[PDB]
Backbone:
């Protein structure tokens, strides 16, 4: 009588919700307070706690691409500007200048285990006589690959 | 969802489930996959916008305790579509029994 | 006698009512009160609470496209204008300028769980001598994909 259609089923579901990374930012105001910057002046500014990376319990490798997009603008104001991106635990993984504007800071599973804080060190010299107020520098952070 | 109640005589049933308005829900959904949960954890049926016919059959051990057919649906509503009270109608056919 | 037409039926209904997202706006009046903007002036303006996203209990991923449509108009008035769209919890996901006018801020399930407030930071310099009153800047918000 009944000729059973021999076909049973099994199923499953996978939930991919979050993105691997969170770039929490604390922007810098470099002349700061209780310090001063003059026109034509030379020196160094540093912020130790600038870009924080927070990852899920699953992600263990990240490769970030930092990009300086308005570098053609700060060229009209600065003579040399060299940004050093201080890595997790004293490592320095990044270097940005008016000429060379792309960095490739990558992070491993030991560094992500304790929170990757990316401070910034800046070496500068304001072009001769230029006087400005609240100049912006904007950096593009791209997560290129992860695992 | 679908309960099968049989007489004390019937012990084998072969049902054909058919999705008839699948050409309509295509205008609204991107993928729709219905899984017909069989009697005691078995899964005997699968319906999609493309593949619309199922052949869930039932044996004498399963009919002895009542065959309840739940439904699991995986869906994604097409981009931006806004609707209210859409119907999906399934044809249940008893093809053979004994 | 009766030759039963063996055909029974089962049915169901699905109710899709709402759209995934609500863009609640609090527009900005940037010269504000108890502050002042001058012609040819330079500086920064910021509004922390500008675009609020409210989602249903079902939606967990949104990808928004922000677009600056009258950027060709503010070019006649401004020298540089750079809008930074401050994301949910300190992240910065968006950048709009007179040249580059499209942004792609996307949001994950952890950020939508607490309300995505999109503040705005603006860096500007009014072209030399231009004097205007109540200039509009209009941004197109598009929900491109969701799930
Ligand atoms: Ca290491
Ligand atoms: Ca990967
Ligand atoms: Ca059995
Ligand atoms: Ca028969
Ligand atoms: Ca609404
Ligand atoms: Ca996130
Ligand atoms: Ca979708």
Residues:
């Amino acid at each position: 009588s009944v000729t059973s259609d021999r076909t049973y089923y099994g199923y499953g579901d996978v939930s991919v919700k979050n993105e691997p990374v969170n770039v929490v930012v604390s922007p810098f105001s470099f002349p700061g307070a209780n310090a001063s910057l003059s026109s034509g002046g030379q020196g160094v500014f540093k912020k130790p706690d600038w870009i924080r990376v927070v990852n899920q319990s699953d992600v263990e490798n990240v490769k970030l691409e930092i990009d300086w997009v308005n570098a053609n603008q700060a060229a009209n104001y600065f003579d040399y500007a060299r940004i050093l991106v201080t890595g997790p635990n004293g490592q320095v993984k990044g270097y940005l200048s008016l000429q060379h504007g792309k960095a490739w800071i990558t992070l491993d599973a030991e560094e992500l285990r304790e929170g990757a804080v990316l401070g910034a060190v800046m070496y500068y010299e304001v072009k001769e006589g230029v006087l400005a107020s609240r100049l912006p520098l904007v950096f593009k952070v791209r997560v290129v690959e992860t695992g």
